[PDB]
Symmetry: D3
Subunit: 151 residues, 6 copies
């Protein structure tokens, strides 16, 4: 009866994201990954699903966007977002306060583990295009697809 | 004989802006709102004028842009800018120092009241388009026009 | 079966604190306020208890300190802390990462509401001693005791 | 009829401080330097007075402390504070919001010039004790007194 | 046998950049300025070369981009980058950590001198287009070319 | 003929420190760890020496303090300092600029590896006293001594 929504573009999902999903999943009864580019919708959904098989209380869903509306529709009142190096925290704070104002939804921030604290969807893609090895920072399902869209 | 310029795009003006205008207006002999998109020039001017009728020592003017040139032309030497959650303060500081360097103009920053600290022109528009209620964060003259550009 | 610990000195508890307690209480099955100076232990406990009567799933407890040990003893794995203006977030982040490292405990941060975002136990006391009125920022049970320790 | 108060310990006054005093003095009808340690009260007053002879509309006064009370007594509603490298801006912002809450007083922040942006009373003293030359960062009246309290 | 790479777009090179180049050049055996828009490639190369004649151990080179690959090819293991007001340090830190992860390359940050701390290629161009005088913040070779692309 | 000084209290030295020492040692001809409390001087020296046997070009020395004087005496012109989570970077920047002003010495900052980014001498001691296991974050020579000063 407790629930958190984890919203993002997830293009593609990274290990920093999965770290947060695991932590949300361990603290709330249900977690919903809301997928709000390099990969299309079902590729992103599939990559999230394939990377979260170990989390039975998590589900993935496309969202169309006011995150607070999505949260409110799912019957929840909490958003969970990760923090990593390069997160624009002032903007996240502005959105958190706006979201509480308009829909009464709370946002809980949690720091990603240090080893995954410097990956982001954008940087991983940019580095990947130029032949940098980011495979230790992304799930296998993502590495698999990233390799294909190279050769 | 004292004067401050409050520069911005004001697309649209928010209650965070009007809060700063009121504070400038109470500390300087004259305030000039310099309007430097969703709304066109006179819509923005009209919304600022309609939202500042209670400030007889404030006037609104379109500006074409080096803010310091505008300030210097008006016979003033001070810029007043607000700070809110999500303000890029490092960039504002860079511009403040550049502005002092090139024209000797000082920039005074003042924090918007907490209740209006999370609204910004951009976020208010984006939330408004998606049916979020931001009317408590914007002046009536703006809410009025925002409603029309919806229906 | 879900639970969060809200740790602090609470000397005295403020409305920013109670705001966070309410949000924790609404998202977790049990909340434990861990009280880790101007007021002594039971005064602090009493002020927290008196200010949280509307939260049946919250309890107050003195803690002796590694917060993670307290959390682990209570059968929980989550800490919830508020953020306000003046919070030393880099230090909170350092502690959050250390806490995850040593005991696997997650820390969730949530922003206090804007109206209570500038109060802190320290500043409220310092302002109170000098005759400033901070009563709108503190619970009645605290205002009551603060008045007495004045006259 | 406009006025700003510039509060601080000024132990001792630095060129970063005098830079702000000059900018306040040029934008307001009256400026009051409120002196709220290495030097005693009149040494600090004397050093401020000696360093501001070129500012006829500035006066120096000892203050006993809620700054807002001092401001309100002088008939003003504005505080002006400088920002330099190492300023704890989050704490200054917390105090600015508290000050507006309790007495309706506004606080205007202005960045000190780059050349004086790294001096602070504390660092100048600590460096001076260890024989570092900080004379280009402090007024002559201060350098004069600092030399004596060395030999 | 020690070496640092200083990467950037340098469009155009500023005195903040040359300050960092000088400091790198004084601490490492070789410095390579890697040029990764208003000016084309050889204009940028020429402006860097003309502004660094006093640095015999510095050379300029176009780079095609993973900076770490460029560094590794030159036989070095260090990147040197400047910090100025408005630098997005969190993003630089994210890239520094990613760069160490993928290629084992270290990044050393050094603060530009205060007098050049507020210039950036972008701001200098934008100010220059609008007739602001930024000549004290840019090398003569750049001022010379900037003047021409005006008249 | 190149050299960096790494200054600090090192009470005790941590793996975040040794990470920086290794990176300095790999980029400069000589590194000098300047030791400027829980452990006394030779305990700290011994712990640094024992933790740096793999760095032949590093030496340890007690310093008496203006760091810039120490640097200048050793014949060097560079300070190398690490950044970790909780570092007061604004204060480090203020000192870096002051140090350049008074002695022309440059300060290069480098980010500690993510896995050691949350340890600090202070936090490691405080956690250690309360029975937290920080052994993965400190060198064996330190863990050895920390164990003894427990039993
Ligand atoms: O927009 C996005 O996809 C990023 C938003 N986000 C959500 C969870 C999470 C965890 C770490 C870093 C960023 C995160
Ligand atoms: O570009 C803009 O319009 C914003 C610039 N600005 C000017 C006054 C003010 C008050 C609060 C927040 C931002 C503000
Ligand atoms: O040490 C303390 O008491 C403050 C720690 N803390 C815990 C909850 C909370 C909410 C807002 C601000 C600070 C808070
Ligand atoms: O407490 C203090 O004395 C510092 C407060 N302060 C007041 C004016 C000013 C200018 C630059 C830097 C700090 C300043
Ligand atoms: O992208 C760029 O060109 C800026 C990157 N950069 C490199 C050296 C340097 C010095 C001061 C400021 C920025 C700097
Ligand atoms: O005062 C101190 O000992 C810390 C100063 N310091 C020097 C190197 C280093 C590396 C990581 C973190 C802090 C560091």
């Amino acid at each position: 009866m407790t629930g958190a929504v984890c919203p993002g573009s997830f293009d593609p999902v990274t290990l920093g994201h999965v770290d947060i999903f695991e932590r949300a999943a361990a603290q709330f009864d249900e977690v919903v990954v809301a997928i709000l580019g390099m990969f299309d919708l079902d590729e992103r959904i599939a990559m999230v699903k394939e990377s979260t098989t170990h989390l039975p209380n998590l589900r993935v869903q496309v969202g169309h966007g006011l995150v607070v509306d999505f949260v409110r529709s799912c019957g929840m009142t909490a958003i969970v977002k990760g923090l990593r190096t390069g997160t624009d925290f002032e903007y996240e704070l502005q959105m958190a306060q706006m979201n509480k104002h308009i829909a009464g939804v709370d946002t809980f921030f949690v720091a990603t583990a240090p080893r995954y604290s410097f990956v982001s969807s954008s940087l991983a893609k940019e580095v990947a295009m130029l032949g940098g090895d980011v495979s230790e920072l992304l799930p296998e399902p993502v590495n698999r697809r990233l390799r294909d869209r190279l050769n």
